[PDB]
Symmetry: D3
Subunit: 241 residues, 6 copies
Amino acid sequence: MNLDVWQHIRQEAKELAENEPMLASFFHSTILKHQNLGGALSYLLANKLANPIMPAISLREIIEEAYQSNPSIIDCAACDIQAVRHRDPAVELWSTPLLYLKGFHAIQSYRITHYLWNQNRKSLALYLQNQISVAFDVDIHPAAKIGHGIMFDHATGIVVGETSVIENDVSILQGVTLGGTGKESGDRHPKVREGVMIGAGAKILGNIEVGKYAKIGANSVVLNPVPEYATAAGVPARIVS
Amino acid sequence: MNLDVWQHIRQEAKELAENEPMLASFFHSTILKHQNLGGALSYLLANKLANPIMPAISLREIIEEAYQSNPSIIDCAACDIQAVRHRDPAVELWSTPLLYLKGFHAIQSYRITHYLWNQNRKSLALYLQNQISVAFDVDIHPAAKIGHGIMFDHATGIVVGETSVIENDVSILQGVTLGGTGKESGDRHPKVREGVMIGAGAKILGNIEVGKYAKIGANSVVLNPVPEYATAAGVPARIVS
Amino acid sequence: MNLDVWQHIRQEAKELAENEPMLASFFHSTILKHQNLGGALSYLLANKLANPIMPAISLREIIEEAYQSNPSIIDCAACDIQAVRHRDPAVELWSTPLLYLKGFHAIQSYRITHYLWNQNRKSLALYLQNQISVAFDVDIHPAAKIGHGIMFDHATGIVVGETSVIENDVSILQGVTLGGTGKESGDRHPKVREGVMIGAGAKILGNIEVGKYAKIGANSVVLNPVPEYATAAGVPARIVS
Amino acid sequence: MNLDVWQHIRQEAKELAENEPMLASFFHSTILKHQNLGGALSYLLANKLANPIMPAISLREIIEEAYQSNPSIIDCAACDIQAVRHRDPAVELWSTPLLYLKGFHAIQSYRITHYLWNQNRKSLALYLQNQISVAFDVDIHPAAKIGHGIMFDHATGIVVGETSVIENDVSILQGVTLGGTGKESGDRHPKVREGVMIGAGAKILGNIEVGKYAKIGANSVVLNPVPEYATAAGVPARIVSQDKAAKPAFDMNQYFI
Amino acid sequence: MNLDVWQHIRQEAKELAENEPMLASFFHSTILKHQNLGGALSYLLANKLANPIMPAISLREIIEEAYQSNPSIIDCAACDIQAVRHRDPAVELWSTPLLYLKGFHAIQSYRITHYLWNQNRKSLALYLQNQISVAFDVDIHPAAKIGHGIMFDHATGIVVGETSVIENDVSILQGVTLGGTGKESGDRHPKVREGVMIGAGAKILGNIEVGKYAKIGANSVVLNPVPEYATAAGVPARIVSQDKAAKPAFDMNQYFI
Amino acid sequence: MNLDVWQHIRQEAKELAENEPMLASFFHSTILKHQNLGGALSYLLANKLANPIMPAISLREIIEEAYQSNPSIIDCAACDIQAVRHRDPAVELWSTPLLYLKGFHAIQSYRITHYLWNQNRKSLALYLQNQISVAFDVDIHPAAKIGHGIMFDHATGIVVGETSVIENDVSILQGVTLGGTGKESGDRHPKVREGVMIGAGAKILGNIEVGKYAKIGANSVVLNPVPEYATAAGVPARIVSQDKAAKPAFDMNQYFI
Ligand SMILES: [Mg+2]
Ligand SMILES: [Mg+2]
């Protein structure tokens, strides 16, 4: 659930350090030498988003503070790991999401920009919003609201707008946009309810509702609300009974 | 218009340096210590495209020379900033495009590869074409012709081909291609007239005309000309009266 | 064919070193000082995928070993170069694919992760799978089976799944997915036969057959088998006689 | 309390960031964002000693662990800063030692290797001993024993071997060696007692006592014990004079006959 | 005109790029693409002194501003190159000093800190003073005064303190210190007049005049004034001989009795 | 056979990786993955000497080419490691010299520049001569001739000029100069024969023979020939004593009268 997640990854790292000496020091530095998930995650995120403007060493303190303050940030990471492990047939190890999956890195990094944005650090948040778009190819406005148990499989090209809401247990694939229309401010982005699965390349535009457990077809363009448990596909999207 | 743009950014940088000490030196080095937009832009672009093969320090001289020679390159950057400020509801600061928006960085970087390509420096231009695809996820052939007041919102996945033409005040989103068909050379890429807005994921193929102020739907595949002021949507794209 | 490819690139590098002194040392270090394609390719790949966790110098030995062991890895690179030269109207030089095209870099890098994956080095392969998604925006599961004469033009956003098969002489563009459905393991990814051309943004889902020499339309969503020599387009994809 | 020292630095830091925009983020990230000398110090040293083999971010954890086990390592740095501010006429700010003086950085970095040496991490301690010699040009064996209120002015070229001992309040200049003799292990390096000042280039060799409050002339070669309050000079060094009033480490009087 | 010097370098550069393909882009980016010594020099120094705190690209602007305000800083480098080409038998090319000799880089880098020191940018000047000691192993206080036609051969270990003065045409070798004495500010460092050559390892301490055309023996310790055309040697140094014909900085005659 | 030396290192390496997880990948990448000293050495040196101008990956090819043409360069390193393990009481592991001692790295790096110097690649050799002085603080002209079984303990500050010759089994400490004299090319640097040990800071200047098995006292200044088995000390150096039994390079006896 949480303690299980970190111990599954802890036990795995030991074995993978033995099988691949070239990464032994990486497994030790990232996983094996820390006492909890936050230690591994702040380390990995700091390194992936580093830049001389804001070096890993500086970034890590900012990340740790965030974790110390709102610990739930780490619980959500634990749940996201479990989601990928449970919904992605290609994933066979608990440590894989944590170490190599840019979609998962993008999500946890967004949790940091979301935290900064709500701590009155808009500049640093926009600066990291871009770092995240660059390092992971995922662009999430810091003010978007995203829950836990979320999976961004492959992730390249995902874009989530300012007023977006993604509830728990949502899965999103490469090239999917949750964007808006109009040159005005206010609610103009999608509300994706829990359990929703979005196919690769789908574009959901406007402040529209995406019912829970709905399935959105690859390359579908959703412009109108999608009932709960329904399947929308096509351009524009239609409900396929 | 131009002098207003740089002074809006100059005044903003001072305030953001006060609110975020961690980036104070970044605001000063990039914006506050230079006398004009070109000083800030050449600095930022050099750093974002740096690589040991061609370091920021070396790149910057090449960029500055370009600016010195054809100053309009900087005016166009000023107009692009204003475009984003005016068409993107998420943007609230004039400095945001300049500092963090990879789409805007991609555009101005392309202006440099376009300049190099027309100075008989094809190698360096192809080398930077790739740097730009890597750093910003935007691939623009150096020979494409692009005007000013252009916005690449989010930008991940945009591709513009060799014979493409994009006129002024055009807005393009993530995943959009202006590509061609055929294994032959010659005109084989889109001509997008002024004011045109292209939705996320749209693919416009061939040497076809995209009338002014037309609107192209997300994920639309345009294979035939689109009349001025019209709206094309669907796969293939159809005119929605 | 093979010896011709490396000599076309060798002769070109000399001329481009003369025309662009700023890259002279790059042409010499990458091309002119090595005796064969593997020398240039291992050098370039090591540098593009470097990271302190696994530096270029360390990566290069791993790459060289791979080449020494299975030399065909380099022949396939030679064929891929020729494919781009022959199918991409924008390419005018044999060295261009080798030096600047991220799609081609992604393919050859995948050949290394495929080799590592079959040498019982799953960790290192997943680590490089992510490096490749980051450096080139292309995500290829290491167990995918890909032949030679392959072209990933532009490439941003391409995703190839675990059980995928891509035969020879296949061309794939930006945003295309060869993905799967279901949370189960087993064959769940596309089988693209030889000669197949896939348009930008196409999403091919499931363990389905894509007949040889078929043409897939941009943004097409293929969910059912496509006969040989046929053209599929639309969402879902339909056969356009 | 070593907080006064830190108070001075934090105070300088705010005004320094105000005057030099180009170093603002550096002052805030090293000094101002931290509430004690330990956070500044670990940050700085980890950055100066960084290498892909052991990156700044990794090394910093190792240093904070050492400060957690041995807080006195931080207080020792405070005093070392106080020693420089008082004895080095060139140093007017309390922040200068901390931010820029490589002899200071070296001594503090050594304290970290000294800690690892006895944590059963000798490979890492040797790795860092070398990182220190390369980064600051100072080679201090991790098993050496060094007190506090120590100044290594300029520092380039300083060598301090395995069995060396250096007590509190000693001033050492560039080029100085506290070297061993022989090809066997065991006590074979100098024991420099408090208040001793050693001039530039001086070489002290073997297991010999350098008397408290003694003064070692520049470029001398000391091979025999030196009496307290005595001044040794020459190649080889000879006891040329004696002052029982002087305080060589604090006076920094370089003249001798 | 210091263009002759530059003409020689540019001429060597074209042929050097021709012979060593691996360094071509380095020769073009530093030398050939620039039309004067200033562009080459700022490029090189900014690269050698670079750090995430102050990256090459940022530092270079700071250097070009200094060259714009004080063009003589560039002409001083030309002469320093001429001094090495003439006095160092090991140096056959005019481009060698500029491209590779760390003592040269140090002196030029110091001139930049000297300029910042009086631009009200002492924090940056101290930051760089340290960057210089770390990059080239040479520690020159920014307030020191140094003329032109100066050679720091090998240079590792050279220290020049705050109130030091060095006139034109002086040759200084590795390990040399122009050091202070005392714990108080004020004139307390050596004043080395033209044509003086100082052998490796020599330590000159206090506010003392080192006579024009004098010759300082290696490893000596100078604590009293040295007469013009005199040769001082020993620990402590003694005036052992005098030659009124010699030109120590140019002859580089290291022998003494 | 220099494989015994390598066997020791590989053996230490496995257990070292076992004890210090944080350095595991470093031990495997440098030592364990390679089957001979050449692969470890080229890897390490290329990494220590790396610069965007000549990156580790490029430089390494240049080094492997040198080892392919001149395998004895590797065997020379084996012996240099053996020399340190035997003479330096501080060094207990055979892997220490190889992994961490900058004087060792310098000597091996020089051997590469010496090879390039006569491959018609003098620009690259000078580029590296400087990379070596900056990375390890040791300046060895590429045209210098150095034997094997050589130890540069601590090494900071060592300078060895163009025409210098150093035979087998010599021990040299930090601050030592084998320097030239005069402003003309030609033989003008020391010739140090086997078994000679040179104390810290010593300066040997001009084309003079330093007799086999001789012992040079720390901080001495040698300007005249030194007889075999003789001990020279002082500024200027004088022959103070003679031992025909001693073996200075191996004994490392630093005391003198
Ligand atoms: Mg990317
Ligand atoms: Mg150094």
